[PDB]
Amino acid sequence: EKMGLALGRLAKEDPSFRVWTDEESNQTIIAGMGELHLDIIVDRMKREFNVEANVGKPQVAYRETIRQKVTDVEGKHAKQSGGRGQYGHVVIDMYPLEPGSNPKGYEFINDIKGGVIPGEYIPAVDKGIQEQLKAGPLAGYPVVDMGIRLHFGSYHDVDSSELAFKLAASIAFKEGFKKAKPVLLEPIMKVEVETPEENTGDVIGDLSRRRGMLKGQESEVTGVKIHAEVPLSEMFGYATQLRSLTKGRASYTMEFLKYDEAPSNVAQAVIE
Amino acid sequence: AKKVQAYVKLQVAAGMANPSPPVGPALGQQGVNIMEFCKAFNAKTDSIEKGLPIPVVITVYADRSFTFVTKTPP
Amino acid sequence: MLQPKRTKFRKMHKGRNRGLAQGTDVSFGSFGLKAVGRGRLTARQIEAARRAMTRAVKRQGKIWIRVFPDKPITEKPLAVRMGKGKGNVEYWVALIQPGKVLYEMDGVPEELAREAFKLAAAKLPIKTTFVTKTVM
Amino acid sequence: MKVRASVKKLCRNCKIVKRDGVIRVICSAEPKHKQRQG
Amino acid sequence: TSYIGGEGHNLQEHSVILIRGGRVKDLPGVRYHTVRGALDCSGVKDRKQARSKYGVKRPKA
RNA sequence: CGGCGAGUAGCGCAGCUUGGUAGCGCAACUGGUUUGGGACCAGUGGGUCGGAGGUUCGAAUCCUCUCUCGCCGACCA
RNA sequence: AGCCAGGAUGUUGGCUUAGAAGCAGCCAUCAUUUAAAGAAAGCGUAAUAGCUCACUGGUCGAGUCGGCCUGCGCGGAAGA
């Protein structure tokens, strides 16, 4: 609270100083003009506003997908208590979406001829999986490239509510996810470097050392513009580093572009 | 052209213009203004045949003036 | 990781490593690593030296490993008073006598074969030497 | 420098001199190659 | 815990709002209200009828 | 670890004593009865015996070696 | 062996074409100009450029260089 009022007000002294919001973590994102600027800001309030909110470092996204497709995972439901004997079974066939640009990274085609599954239960099977998109059974994370097809089902004629079928999708989704091995992905950053003439050679080091792939290398009269994509996670602190090795005669522009299949060495880290 | 006075040694497409993207740091490596040359690059590059990769030589003084030489498309 | 596939007797005596070696000429290849040493060459020492020549050829060569371990060696668990019969087999070993041909590279050039042995030989315990083909 | 039982002519200009009974390596201007204990 | 009228808003989780009375008969325990048009919780987005409530400045046009 | 004891359908237990042909139960599947579910009433499929190797004509079975899990001890200074 | 010198051409020889320009790597490991020069043994770059080497000419001017087999030595070698 004494930060919300502080950094809230601390947005006026330096409108070059930014206050933000971690996606679903809400931890305040701070953007400034260098550790020097930030550090000074840290103690600028340590006593002036007594602000002891231990600012640290940013946080990753790490969304998920599936390595491959499934064949015929089936999940039924056997709650035959009596009078409301919940009974719901579906035969889903999940397929990863191949890198496209449809605003939704999802594709659900309804493969039921009806009778095998009564029609008005389409939304049920549909939203049934839609629930499991916030429970990534590795570390509970959202998934991408998800594409689901449904083969057939099963019902009981005095029963099988939406509840029966909202769960049938709820249960059998992870089944193919189990069959079709998942993977952890990360945001990849589009960077347009700018380093005069000489350090051009030396700048490539950090560009590549953080596992970044040099796409385009350009130049002009007294300047140079370089292209590459590099993971967001493995890009923090760079503002300092770039000027830390070019005599500040350099700056850059950065933006997200894509998600990719990270390696396992990376994978056994987000487990938490 | 001296032995080597920072002259580009390969080229760009015979009919294309603005050798900016592919070679990148090397064409303007001497400070060569693409402006002054790209208009004349094609002048004797569009001359024989367009689009068939030819090799060109552009050797620039410190007094900033080149000499134009071309060789056989590989 | 060579090992006798279902021999008769499980355990066998200590024996003695004596006399000049017998397999002493380049059977198949043009080059070889003949062992001047005299001693017990274990199974692991075989695999190590093999791959370490498998790389110098990189893929391209035919290689025959002459020696086969064939001799079980026993041990004793590290907390026992001496007694209670023969111990447990732990690893196999191929006796060597001086003059024994161990490896053969044929087809590859001479120097690489020369270069090849060095890498592996460094892993071998007993001193060895470079031999070249002779007719009869 | 480095100490090790076995030294070798690593680069093109490696040199070896039996200085005071000790074997060592003096390249020319390649610093990372100085060795002794040969 | 209060009621948030105005079919949406812009603010959340770090601000100063202004409460009023007003139970809801529809949720457990909730008995209050924010004040659309107050400090951080704004006058609602372009409505006409009964706009005094919901703090809509009279549309000049 | 050495020293003895089990490893059998889906699950849990007989059959191994002495060699020939693996049984019972709840489960699963199908039908009946009911408005439907359960219970109940009639049928059925399912292991072929933990594994490696021998004994013999033939091994769940008699032996020998590993691996899984248990009971027992790893004591006198 | 030194001191003086040349050490190049088509031509980045395609790909993974983001760049493999005599030198990250792959295949060929060409053929011309020739006293000579590998489309390369090495250093240096993001890649060039740059300094040499292979090899070849001048001078000085005589022996010199690389393997194998032995004998005798040095290093490896730190305790109260």
XYZ file of C-alpha atoms (C1' of nucleotides) in Angstrom:
738
model
C 0.000 0.000 0.000
C 2.803 2.402 0.796
C 4.315 1.193 -2.487
C 1.006 1.588 -4.452
C 0.775 5.171 -3.329
C 4.557 5.621 -3.678
C 5.284 4.125 -7.119
C 1.897 5.443 -8.137
C 3.203 8.903 -7.265
C 6.735 7.798 -8.326
C 5.293 7.689 -11.838
C 5.146 11.526 -11.917
C 8.706 12.514 -11.035
C 9.898 10.284 -13.819
C 7.234 9.596 -16.489
C 10.228 7.817 -18.120
C 9.893 5.445 -15.095
C 7.154 2.858 -15.663
C 4.904 0.896 -13.311
C 3.197 -2.245 -14.573
C 1.518 -5.535 -13.834
C 2.726 -9.118 -13.928
C 0.189 -10.964 -16.113
C -1.352 -13.220 -13.487
C 1.302 -12.718 -10.807
C 0.653 -8.956 -10.486
C 4.178 -8.380 -9.137
C 5.021 -4.852 -10.178
C 7.046 -4.591 -13.363
C 9.532 -1.712 -13.228
C 11.027 -0.227 -16.378
C 13.774 2.389 -16.126
C 16.928 3.706 -17.782
C 19.474 1.426 -16.160
C 20.357 -0.282 -12.886
C 21.887 3.047 -11.820
C 18.524 4.748 -12.344
C 16.661 1.855 -10.683
C 19.147 1.418 -7.824
C 18.946 5.124 -7.015
C 15.163 4.774 -7.174
C 15.388 1.830 -4.757
C 17.017 3.953 -2.038
C 15.244 7.173 -3.173
C 12.380 5.711 -1.268
C 14.127 3.377 1.172
C 13.966 6.234 3.587
C 12.055 9.051 1.806
C 9.052 6.854 1.490
C 10.313 3.911 3.679
C 9.500 1.629 0.780
C 10.868 -1.839 1.535
C 9.162 -3.799 -1.201
C 12.143 -6.008 -2.177
C 12.077 -5.546 -5.920
C 13.862 -8.408 -7.621
C 13.774 -9.583 -11.253
C 11.056 -10.364 -13.836
C 9.127 -13.615 -14.246
C 8.722 -16.031 -17.160
C 5.645 -17.151 -19.104
C 6.325 -20.812 -20.027
C 3.240 -21.910 -21.863
C 2.818 -25.479 -23.062
C 2.000 -27.734 -25.975
C 2.073 -31.392 -27.036
C 4.923 -33.202 -28.685
C 2.735 -35.026 -31.141
C -0.791 -36.299 -31.687
C -2.755 -38.972 -29.873
C -4.618 -41.955 -31.253
C -7.834 -42.675 -29.337
C -7.811 -41.756 -25.626
C -11.073 -42.665 -23.912
C -12.426 -41.447 -20.583
C -15.732 -42.681 -19.145
C -17.639 -41.930 -15.945
C -19.149 -44.458 -13.556
C -21.183 -42.598 -10.961
C -24.270 -44.862 -10.903
C -25.416 -43.794 -7.410
C -29.136 -43.868 -8.168
C -31.719 -41.485 -9.600
C -28.894 -39.263 -10.906
C -26.406 -41.904 -11.984
C -23.899 -39.585 -13.724
C -22.640 -41.336 -16.874
C -20.397 -39.662 -19.369
C -17.795 -40.946 -21.819
C -15.978 -39.478 -24.805
C -13.300 -40.635 -27.252
C -11.180 -37.587 -27.975
C -8.324 -37.416 -30.481
C -6.028 -34.498 -29.706
C -3.692 -33.078 -32.333
C -1.219 -30.267 -31.967
C -1.905 -27.270 -34.161
C 1.038 -26.709 -36.540
C 2.413 -23.134 -36.221
C -0.283 -20.925 -37.688
C -1.626 -17.407 -37.228
C -5.339 -17.930 -36.416
C -5.857 -15.531 -33.406
C -6.720 -18.534 -31.358
C -4.056 -21.199 -31.280
C -6.795 -23.865 -31.224
C -8.736 -26.192 -33.474
C -11.686 -28.309 -32.320
C -13.546 -30.257 -35.007
C -16.679 -32.146 -33.961
C -16.427 -35.711 -35.372
C -19.656 -37.093 -34.043
C -22.485 -38.232 -36.260
C -25.087 -37.771 -33.450
C -26.822 -40.546 -31.556
C -23.383 -41.726 -30.381
C -23.430 -38.315 -28.627
C -26.641 -36.205 -28.414
C -26.135 -32.894 -30.147
C -26.873 -30.243 -27.539
C -23.979 -31.752 -25.571
C -21.427 -30.289 -28.033
C -20.757 -27.240 -25.807
C -20.324 -29.713 -22.885
C -17.552 -31.757 -24.515
C -16.253 -28.394 -25.828
C -15.998 -26.452 -22.589
C -15.096 -29.680 -20.792
C -11.656 -29.485 -22.286
C -11.677 -25.638 -22.120
C -11.490 -26.132 -18.370
C -8.358 -28.273 -18.579
C -6.482 -25.428 -20.357
C -5.433 -23.858 -17.047
C -4.186 -27.112 -15.494
C -0.938 -28.063 -17.264
C 0.003 -31.319 -15.543
C 3.701 -30.501 -15.372
C 3.488 -27.236 -13.404
C -0.165 -26.193 -13.939
C 0.221 -23.972 -16.963
C -1.725 -22.855 -20.015
C -1.266 -24.731 -23.243
C -0.931 -23.768 -26.955
C -1.272 -25.419 -30.391
C -4.059 -27.452 -28.831
C -6.279 -29.177 -31.376
C -8.931 -31.716 -30.432
C -11.016 -34.158 -32.432
C -13.722 -36.368 -30.957
C -14.290 -39.963 -32.184
C -17.288 -41.308 -30.270
C -18.962 -41.426 -26.869
C -21.439 -43.205 -24.606
C -24.458 -42.189 -22.549
C -27.255 -43.531 -20.345
C -30.867 -42.717 -21.219
C -32.047 -41.607 -17.780
C -28.860 -39.675 -17.180
C -25.679 -38.260 -18.748
C -25.990 -34.598 -17.878
C -23.663 -31.910 -19.119
C -21.893 -32.759 -15.812
C -21.493 -36.343 -16.993
C -19.916 -35.051 -20.222
C -18.185 -31.915 -18.994
C -16.088 -34.312 -16.991
C -15.569 -36.926 -19.680
C -13.695 -34.268 -21.556
C -12.117 -33.064 -18.271
C -10.706 -36.504 -17.624
C -9.633 -37.868 -20.967
C -7.834 -34.751 -21.999
C -4.810 -35.366 -19.924
C -4.868 -38.992 -21.152
C -3.606 -38.121 -24.629
C -1.410 -35.449 -23.001
C 0.062 -38.418 -21.124
C 0.259 -40.455 -24.366
C 1.540 -37.477 -26.360
C 4.415 -36.148 -24.269
C 4.267 -32.439 -23.523
C 6.961 -29.811 -23.683
C 7.757 -26.403 -22.159
C 7.957 -23.371 -24.422
C 9.122 -19.837 -24.049
C 8.683 -16.388 -25.622
C 11.375 -15.495 -28.214
C 12.349 -11.846 -28.581
C 12.766 -9.911 -31.814
C 15.706 -7.563 -31.343
C 17.004 -4.871 -33.701
C 20.503 -4.129 -32.444
C 22.301 -0.841 -33.063
C 26.119 -0.653 -32.522
C 28.163 1.870 -34.590
C 31.034 0.302 -36.328
C 33.641 -1.654 -34.242
C 31.885 -3.349 -31.349
C 29.614 -4.736 -34.128
C 32.077 -7.708 -33.920
C 32.144 -7.782 -30.102
C 28.448 -7.171 -29.665
C 27.692 -10.479 -31.320
C 29.122 -12.232 -28.338
C 26.347 -11.399 -25.878
C 23.835 -11.591 -28.759
C 24.778 -15.217 -29.204
C 25.990 -16.131 -25.742
C 22.457 -16.044 -24.435
C 21.628 -18.630 -27.083
C 20.402 -15.975 -29.557
C 20.308 -16.597 -33.311
C 21.538 -13.805 -35.566
C 18.979 -13.492 -38.344
C 19.916 -10.265 -40.115
C 23.142 -8.245 -40.125
C 22.935 -4.815 -41.762
C 24.806 -1.520 -41.864
C 24.748 2.085 -43.045
C 27.113 5.067 -43.424
C 28.400 5.063 -39.807
C 26.092 2.549 -38.192
C 25.025 -1.036 -38.059
C 21.640 -2.696 -37.517
C 21.495 -6.375 -36.520
C 18.609 -8.827 -36.311
C 18.182 -11.880 -34.129
C 15.638 -13.684 -31.953
C 16.542 -14.693 -28.366
C 14.514 -15.931 -25.400
C 12.884 -13.350 -23.200
C 13.869 -15.241 -20.011
C 17.470 -15.294 -21.109
C 17.486 -11.537 -21.889
C 17.285 -9.772 -18.567
C 19.767 -7.044 -17.544
C 20.761 -6.490 -21.121
C 20.243 -2.714 -21.007
C 23.265 -2.559 -18.759
C 25.303 -5.111 -20.693
C 24.847 -3.606 -24.153
C 26.108 -0.223 -23.079
C 28.528 -1.994 -20.728
C 30.454 -3.230 -23.768
C 29.952 -0.476 -26.357
C 30.673 2.683 -24.350
C 26.956 3.435 -24.335
C 27.145 4.289 -28.029
C 24.436 1.718 -28.578
C 20.774 1.046 -27.943
C 18.187 -1.442 -29.153
C 14.516 -2.240 -29.745
C 12.873 -5.441 -28.551
C 9.562 -7.218 -28.936
C 8.083 -10.696 -28.671
C 7.439 -12.832 -31.670
C 7.143 -16.553 -31.017
C 7.040 -19.581 -28.736
C 9.273 -22.604 -29.242
C 10.037 -26.100 -27.913
C 12.661 -25.542 -25.256
C 15.059 -28.364 -24.335
C 14.637 -30.586 -21.277
C 17.645 -29.046 -19.513
C 15.531 -25.929 -19.479
C 12.415 -28.001 -18.688
C 13.544 -29.417 -15.384
C 13.572 -25.913 -13.960
C 9.970 -24.649 -14.170
C 8.938 -27.630 -12.047
C 7.837 -25.863 -8.862
C 42.454 -0.422 -57.498
C 45.494 -0.935 -55.270
C 46.454 -4.437 -53.995
C 43.548 -4.215 -51.554
C 42.049 -0.822 -50.607
C 38.921 -2.195 -48.879
C 37.101 -3.242 -52.027
C 34.056 -5.480 -52.145
C 34.925 -8.768 -53.882
C 31.777 -10.639 -54.773
C 28.599 -8.849 -55.746
C 24.907 -8.879 -55.690
C 22.421 -9.957 -58.333
C 23.050 -8.675 -61.851
C 19.707 -6.946 -62.184
C 18.796 -6.250 -58.576
C 19.213 -2.955 -56.720
C 20.252 -1.688 -53.254
C 22.855 -4.379 -52.119
C 21.791 -3.739 -48.579
C 20.342 -6.870 -47.010
C 22.574 -9.731 -48.121
C 26.067 -8.447 -47.682
C 25.140 -6.174 -44.889
C 28.183 -4.789 -43.057
C 30.537 -5.225 -46.000
C 29.317 -2.894 -48.743
C 29.153 0.040 -46.529
C 32.284 -1.096 -44.776
C 34.217 1.740 -46.301
C 31.474 4.239 -45.681
C 30.489 3.494 -49.320
C 27.354 5.509 -50.012
C 24.905 3.085 -51.593
C 23.232 6.276 -52.896
C 26.085 7.259 -55.240
C 26.698 3.760 -56.402
C 23.422 1.885 -56.568
C 22.307 4.224 -59.228
C 25.446 3.436 -61.161
C 25.839 -0.166 -59.948
C 23.161 -1.329 -62.286
C 24.455 1.073 -64.955
C 27.024 -1.422 -66.185
C 25.412 -4.419 -64.406
C 22.047 -4.063 -66.099
C 24.249 -3.525 -69.180
C 24.892 -7.064 -70.150
C 22.293 -9.310 -68.588
C 19.923 -8.901 -65.656
C 19.506 -11.313 -62.772
C 22.532 -13.542 -63.585
C 24.954 -13.146 -60.638
C 28.021 -11.318 -61.716
C 31.170 -10.461 -59.705
C 32.048 -6.744 -59.287
C 35.004 -4.861 -57.853
C 34.641 -1.478 -56.179
C 37.953 -0.096 -54.861
C 37.582 3.238 -53.072
C 40.210 5.833 -52.332
C 40.628 7.556 -48.993
C 39.863 10.595 -51.281
C 36.588 8.650 -51.709
C 36.284 7.669 -55.355
C 36.148 4.111 -56.680
C 37.190 2.260 -59.816
C 34.645 -0.009 -61.560
C 35.619 -3.519 -62.580
C 33.444 -6.574 -63.254
C 34.248 -10.207 -63.994
C 32.557 -13.327 -65.241
C 29.306 -14.449 -63.561
C 30.725 -17.580 -61.869
C 31.533 -55.046 -23.073
C 32.673 -58.533 -24.045
C 31.891 -61.397 -21.708
C 31.796 -65.186 -22.099
C 28.253 -66.088 -23.023
C 27.324 -68.990 -20.778
C 30.586 -70.782 -20.075
C 30.762 -74.085 -18.165
C 32.359 -73.305 -14.794
C 31.349 -70.181 -12.937
C 34.670 -69.573 -11.198
C 38.223 -70.506 -12.145
C 41.723 -70.361 -10.719
C 44.318 -67.630 -10.715
C 46.803 -69.239 -13.072
C 50.025 -67.737 -14.347
C 50.836 -65.315 -17.162
C 54.021 -66.729 -18.657
C 55.743 -67.454 -21.932
C 55.774 -65.562 -25.188
C 52.405 -64.691 -26.733
C 50.944 -66.840 -29.507
C 48.660 -64.770 -31.749
C 51.567 -62.713 -33.030
C 51.008 -61.663 -36.618
C 48.646 -59.323 -38.413
C 45.936 -61.800 -39.260
C 43.661 -59.629 -41.346
C 44.594 -55.978 -41.370
C 47.621 -54.117 -42.534
C 48.269 -52.457 -39.185
C 48.137 -53.494 -35.594
C 48.810 -52.701 -31.978
C 51.085 -55.479 -30.686
C 51.489 -55.691 -26.941
C 55.017 -55.579 -25.608
C 53.564 -55.591 -22.094
C 52.801 -58.681 -20.022
C 49.760 -58.518 -17.859
C 46.032 -58.765 -17.224
C 43.898 -56.740 -19.570
C 40.362 -56.259 -18.363
C 37.049 -55.872 -20.251
C 36.547 -52.153 -19.705
C 40.075 -51.524 -20.969
C 38.929 -53.217 -24.142
C 35.852 -51.089 -24.788
C 37.650 -47.849 -23.951
C 40.406 -48.528 -26.442
C 37.950 -49.634 -29.093
C 35.788 -46.543 -29.277
C 38.917 -44.424 -28.993
C 39.965 -45.803 -32.363
C 36.409 -45.950 -33.639
C 36.612 -42.145 -33.609
C 39.946 -41.729 -35.393
C 38.445 -43.731 -38.260
C 35.253 -41.689 -37.577
C 33.206 -44.354 -39.169
C 35.324 -45.687 -41.963
C 37.324 -48.741 -41.268
C 37.226 -52.427 -40.512
C 38.500 -53.242 -37.018
C 39.110 -56.586 -35.403
C 39.644 -56.782 -31.618
C 41.799 -59.877 -31.315
C 41.722 -60.505 -27.600
C 38.690 -61.831 -25.792
C 38.543 -61.476 -21.968
C 37.326 -65.027 -21.210
C 38.714 -65.147 -17.684
C 36.485 -64.444 -14.723
C 38.092 -62.596 -11.822
C 36.712 -62.678 -8.254
C 36.684 -60.230 -5.368
C 35.843 -59.990 -1.698
C 33.256 -57.659 -0.139
C 35.166 -54.976 1.731
C 34.301 -55.942 5.295
C 35.148 -59.631 5.529
C 37.577 -61.732 7.520
C 39.383 -64.159 5.233
C 37.371 -67.317 4.874
C 34.181 -68.708 3.452
C 35.433 -69.912 0.113
C 35.950 -68.181 -3.198
C 34.419 -64.745 -3.548
C 32.268 -63.158 -6.221
C 33.030 -62.571 -9.863
C 33.429 -58.876 -10.575
C 35.051 -58.442 -13.967
C 36.628 -60.377 -16.831
C 40.182 -60.197 -18.097
C 42.176 -61.387 -21.084
C 45.677 -62.531 -20.251
C 48.361 -60.989 -22.390
C 51.857 -62.123 -23.199
C 54.485 -60.015 -24.956
C 54.097 -60.142 -28.709
C 50.343 -60.460 -28.774
C 48.493 -58.663 -31.565
C 45.504 -56.792 -30.195
C 43.888 -54.580 -32.829
C 43.845 -54.264 -36.568
C 43.066 -51.365 -38.892
C 42.960 -52.162 -42.562
C 42.093 -49.824 -45.419
C 42.601 -46.484 -43.735
C 45.830 -44.600 -44.476
C 48.971 -45.368 -42.528
C 49.379 -42.233 -40.458
C 45.767 -42.176 -39.326
C 46.140 -45.800 -38.288
C 49.390 -44.679 -36.639
C 47.511 -41.755 -35.087
C 44.608 -44.050 -34.182
C 46.439 -46.501 -32.018
C 48.019 -43.742 -29.963
C 44.668 -42.533 -28.652
C 43.539 -45.963 -27.634
C 46.913 -47.284 -26.498
C 47.103 -44.459 -23.993
C 44.138 -46.094 -22.322
C 45.783 -49.512 -22.245
C 47.772 -50.427 -19.161
C 50.554 -52.484 -20.799
C 53.111 -51.023 -23.168
C 52.420 -51.725 -26.835
C 53.956 -51.047 -30.228
C 53.043 -50.367 -33.840
C 53.276 -53.310 -36.243
C 52.830 -53.527 -40.007
C 51.956 -56.340 -42.326
C 54.375 -59.081 -43.306
C 53.860 -61.923 -45.814
C 54.448 -65.314 -44.175
C 52.396 -21.049 -16.677
C 51.425 -24.692 -16.294
C 53.005 -27.668 -14.563
C 52.614 -31.174 -15.935
C 54.602 -34.314 -16.482
C 54.304 -34.196 -20.259
C 54.803 -31.056 -22.313
C 54.564 -30.912 -26.104
C 55.070 -28.673 -29.126
C 51.486 -27.435 -29.162
C 51.640 -24.558 -31.650
C 53.841 -23.711 -34.605
C 56.444 -21.794 -32.628
C 56.713 -23.841 -29.456
C 60.257 -24.045 -28.105
C 61.964 -26.197 -25.498
C 65.132 -25.318 -23.635
C 66.852 -27.376 -20.911
C 67.258 -24.337 -18.678
C 69.107 -25.282 -15.498
C 68.107 -28.913 -15.875
C 64.454 -28.217 -16.201
C 62.463 -28.736 -19.299
C 60.129 -25.805 -20.222
C 58.141 -24.274 -23.090
C 58.714 -20.744 -24.446
C 56.569 -20.200 -27.555
C 57.361 -16.837 -29.061
C 54.601 -14.523 -27.924
C 51.812 -17.073 -27.199
C 51.240 -16.695 -23.458
C 48.860 -19.552 -22.894
C 51.542 -22.076 -23.774
C 54.232 -21.602 -21.125
C 54.924 -24.963 -19.487
C 57.577 -26.644 -17.364
C 58.320 -29.899 -15.495
C 59.070 -31.874 -18.611
C -16.828 -7.125 0.405
C -18.955 -4.940 -1.846
C -20.910 -4.786 -5.071
C -19.469 -3.615 -8.343
C -22.098 -2.075 -10.516
C -21.684 -0.605 -14.048
C -21.189 -3.658 -16.319
C -17.413 -3.516 -16.090
C -14.828 -0.850 -15.295
C -11.153 -0.081 -15.777
C -9.615 -0.293 -12.278
C -8.479 -3.094 -10.048
C -6.510 -4.169 -6.998
C -4.597 -0.998 -6.266
C -6.743 2.151 -6.005
C -9.104 4.168 -3.814
C -12.811 3.516 -4.304
C -15.855 5.051 -2.628
C -18.491 2.878 -1.015
C -22.183 3.364 -0.397
C -24.993 1.308 1.049
C -27.031 -1.291 -0.752
C -27.476 -4.968 -0.136
C -27.854 -7.340 -3.085
C -30.134 -10.189 -1.919
C -28.111 -12.229 -4.393
C -24.723 -12.897 -2.823
C -23.589 -14.103 0.602
C -22.400 -11.376 2.929
C -22.104 -8.709 0.277
C -24.026 -5.621 1.460
C -22.436 -2.554 -0.073
C -21.639 -0.771 -3.276
C -18.945 1.096 -5.011
C -19.939 4.386 -6.618
C -19.796 4.532 -10.349
C -18.512 8.078 -11.178
C -16.476 8.234 -7.954
C -12.704 8.721 -7.663
C -11.262 5.620 -9.256
C -14.423 3.707 -10.274
C -15.598 5.661 -13.219
C -18.768 7.048 -14.656
C -19.978 4.179 -16.866
C -19.373 3.950 -20.577
C -21.808 5.914 -22.724
C -25.268 5.166 -21.348
C -28.321 7.420 -21.507
C -31.183 6.308 -19.253
C -30.942 7.010 -15.499
C -27.393 8.237 -15.951
C -27.390 10.329 -12.716
C -26.799 7.015 -11.070
C -23.557 5.664 -12.618
C -22.086 9.183 -12.778
C -22.383 9.813 -16.485
C -21.610 13.427 -17.275
C -24.458 14.535 -19.553
C -23.248 13.809 -23.113
C -22.638 17.296 -24.482
C -24.024 16.390 -27.881
C 23.481 -57.963 3.878
C 23.332 -64.077 5.006
C 19.291 -67.063 5.546
C 14.544 -68.469 4.633
C 9.722 -67.330 1.928
C 6.114 -65.735 -0.907
C 6.119 -63.832 -6.731
C -0.950 -67.204 -10.036
C -6.241 -64.181 -14.428
C -8.312 -57.281 -13.187
C -7.632 -57.776 -7.224
C -6.772 -61.347 -3.310
C -5.873 -66.086 -2.282
C -5.806 -72.490 -3.372
C -3.091 -75.886 -6.466
C 3.870 -76.843 -5.771
C 4.358 -81.892 -0.347
C 5.528 -86.582 -4.776
C 5.887 -84.058 -12.448
C 2.045 -84.945 -16.329
C -4.519 -82.246 -16.992
C -3.864 -74.256 -13.111
C -9.554 -73.697 -8.959
C -12.843 -70.310 -5.667
C -14.491 -65.598 -4.831
C -15.728 -59.762 -5.771
C -14.313 -57.477 -10.623
C -15.350 -56.922 -16.543
C -18.825 -58.104 -20.606
C -24.222 -59.751 -22.415
C -29.311 -60.722 -21.347
C -33.412 -60.877 -17.785
C -36.439 -58.140 -13.619
C -37.690 -52.389 -12.745
C -40.288 -46.209 -15.047
C -34.783 -46.286 -14.301
C -30.445 -47.463 -10.720
C -29.034 -51.026 -6.872
C -29.590 -55.828 -4.858
C -31.021 -60.316 -6.963
C -31.579 -64.232 -11.108
C -29.101 -66.944 -15.529
C -24.416 -67.381 -19.205
C -19.543 -66.021 -20.698
C -14.366 -64.364 -21.640
C -10.055 -63.935 -18.943
C -3.703 -66.610 -16.353
C -1.831 -70.511 -18.891
C 2.009 -69.824 -13.426
C 8.131 -63.256 -12.133
C 12.385 -63.809 -15.235
C 17.629 -66.356 -17.224
C 19.358 -71.433 -17.675
C 19.489 -76.581 -17.175
C 17.059 -81.647 -14.988
C 13.523 -85.057 -18.091
C 9.688 -87.833 -22.745
C 7.256 -83.992 -20.087
C 8.322 -78.823 -15.005
C 2.987 -73.925 -11.761
C 5.595 -78.144 -9.894
C 12.627 -80.619 -9.262
C 17.040 -77.924 -9.078
C 20.693 -73.354 -9.939
C 21.366 -67.826 -10.676
C 19.394 -62.876 -10.500
C 15.580 -59.109 -9.574
C 10.719 -57.329 -6.138
C 8.750 -57.306 -1.430
C 8.704 -59.121 3.500
C 10.280 -61.717 8.444
C 15.036 -62.419 11.295
C 20.186 -60.140 12.821
C 24.262 -56.418 11.654
C 26.154 -59.488 19.129
C 30.520 -59.599 23.838
C 34.755 -54.931 24.396
C 69.612 -21.919 -41.645
C 69.438 -16.433 -41.935
C 69.263 -11.620 -44.687
C 66.357 -9.690 -49.973
C 62.109 -11.057 -52.430
C 56.919 -13.504 -55.181
C 53.519 -15.940 -52.847
C 48.290 -14.712 -57.377
C 43.320 -16.568 -61.612
C 37.778 -18.359 -62.908
C 36.277 -18.237 -57.814
C 32.091 -16.668 -52.043
C 33.158 -23.560 -56.028
C 27.357 -25.065 -54.723
C 24.633 -26.187 -49.423
C 22.325 -25.481 -43.758
C 21.662 -20.784 -49.225
C 20.875 -16.118 -42.076
C 27.770 -16.082 -43.607
C 31.350 -20.082 -44.128
C 35.203 -14.912 -49.131
C 42.413 -19.947 -49.046
C 40.839 -21.051 -43.036
C 32.959 -23.994 -38.016
C 31.760 -27.847 -41.296
C 31.093 -30.890 -45.726
C 32.575 -33.254 -51.023
C 35.702 -32.580 -54.990
C 40.635 -31.894 -53.170
C 39.879 -28.983 -60.351
C 42.448 -26.772 -64.058
C 44.805 -22.676 -66.008
C 49.364 -18.435 -65.471
C 54.208 -20.680 -64.353
C 60.922 -19.213 -61.554
C 56.434 -20.714 -58.264
C 52.057 -21.115 -55.323
C 47.923 -25.801 -51.811
C 41.234 -22.953 -54.427
C 45.548 -24.343 -48.361
C 49.737 -26.135 -42.526
C 48.678 -21.625 -39.093
C 47.551 -16.757 -36.520
C 43.654 -12.952 -36.804
C 37.846 -11.293 -37.722
C 30.830 -11.151 -37.710
C 32.801 -11.768 -42.454
C 36.959 -9.035 -45.207
C 41.324 -6.857 -44.797
C 46.242 -7.903 -42.438
C 51.228 -11.010 -40.855
C 53.539 -15.715 -42.596
C 53.941 -20.748 -44.310
C 54.104 -24.451 -47.829
C 57.010 -24.105 -52.478
C 59.912 -21.360 -55.772
C 64.240 -17.246 -57.522
C 69.090 -13.840 -55.553
C 73.453 -13.879 -51.913
C 76.708 -16.270 -48.516
C 78.648 -20.851 -48.572
C 79.657 -25.809 -46.879
C 77.639 -30.726 -45.389
C 73.166 -31.315 -43.439
C 68.175 -33.528 -42.068
C 64.703 -37.307 -40.485
C 63.471 -42.305 -38.646
C 65.020 -47.218 -36.342
C 68.152 -50.157 -32.586
C 70.931 -49.921 -27.967
C 73.917 -48.077 -23.326
C 74.178 -44.466 -19.458
C 71.569 -40.311 -17.348
C 67.054 -35.635 -16.012
C 61.777 -34.747 -14.900
C 57.454 -37.318 -12.704
C 59.386 -37.541 -6.653
C 54.884 -34.392 -0.477
C 54.969 -36.156 6.245
C 55.293 -35.527 10.912
